[PDB]
């Protein structure tokens with residue numbers, strides 16, 4: 001449907017030896033296309049998707065300069081955050097932020113995002129209008145007041161409507177075979193007797209893309225929300241994803257349970273019973 | 276690949 | 283914040299004894315990002331373990347995927363062992379071909 005370019009940035013004050021002071025990974029939808037980091041001030045960049053082989057050398061040369069400047073600015077921000085929060089020196093603190101832009105099926109821009117967190121908690125978020133900010137406390141309220149006085153959201157918008165749109169368009173073009181697809185799940189039910197006479201029914205979904213999915217068990221006349229065990233959707237490592245959901249049921253009543261699967265690649269929810 | 280100065 | 287990792291151990295494809303496959307150790311929901319992950323077969327540390335880049339989710343918690351080549355059998359044991367600063371001690375999770 002719609003397509004998104006996303007970057008996930010992390011800065012660490014006094015990381016461990018050999019660990020990055022700054023790292024960012026970039027995605028189109030659920031496909032990673034690069035890793036950037038800075039260790040002891042040295043920037044490094046690595047491609048991760050096949051379409052990145054088509055980028056010209058200047059792409060990587062400009063990216064390296066961006067990495068150096070971002071890593072120095074994040075380090076400075078972490079130092080000021082320590083002061084405004086009256087925190088002791090020596091400890092290690094974390095600054096994370098996300099950056100994205102989204103286009104619809106016709107490449108029209110639909111939205112964009114900028115949001116930051118400090119030590120794993122929300123700090124500041126850019127609103128849907130792309131012009132105002134939401135803070136969480138009096139420190140982040142200083143940031144908001146400064147960013148609004150200086151009209152900083154204008155330059156984020158220029159980035160969104162400039163490089164973010166440029167890159168999203170070119171990546172989708174060169175990587176169309178990977179990105180413009182929807183692989184539906186392959187589903188089946190597994191049956192495992194338990195030593196007490198009852199039975200585990202495990203509903204599997206494999207090989208689907210994108211990752212968003214839903215699995216649900218249902219009984220004749222009883223809701224199973226609280227009864228069923230779900231695992232977090234997980235990468236198979238080849239581009240696809242997998243998941244399962246399980247319930248314990250008495251032996252002999254297996255055929256009154258049904259597993260429902262919902263996914264983008266399915267025009268209707270799939271239904272499954274044991275055997 | 277964009278960063279905003281917090282403080 | 284000080285979030286504890288959740289761990290799942292599973293094969294890329296549905297396992298079939300004696301068939302080359304990939305074993306995954308998916309670790310999620312932890313913060314800070316520093317973590318140590320090892321994979322073991324029959325008590326021996328596997329040398330060839332590749333790691334994805336670390337990333338993070340909507341709630342800012344981190345996640346990462348470790349994986350290695352393996353051939354399942356009926357007599358071999360596989361585990362993932364994980365240490366994070368939120369844990370007093372390492373936690374080992376064994377592969378179960380049903381999960």
Ligand SMILES: *[C@@H]1O[C@H](CO)[C@@H](O)[C@H](O)[C@H]1NC(C)=O
Pocket residue numbers: 084085086
């Ligand atoms: C830090 O101390 C200053 C006073 O210099 C105060 O205004 C501020 O609220 C304090 N912040 C915290 C997080 O204690």
Ligand code: NA
Pocket residue numbers: 094095096117118119120121342
């Ligand atoms: Na953070």
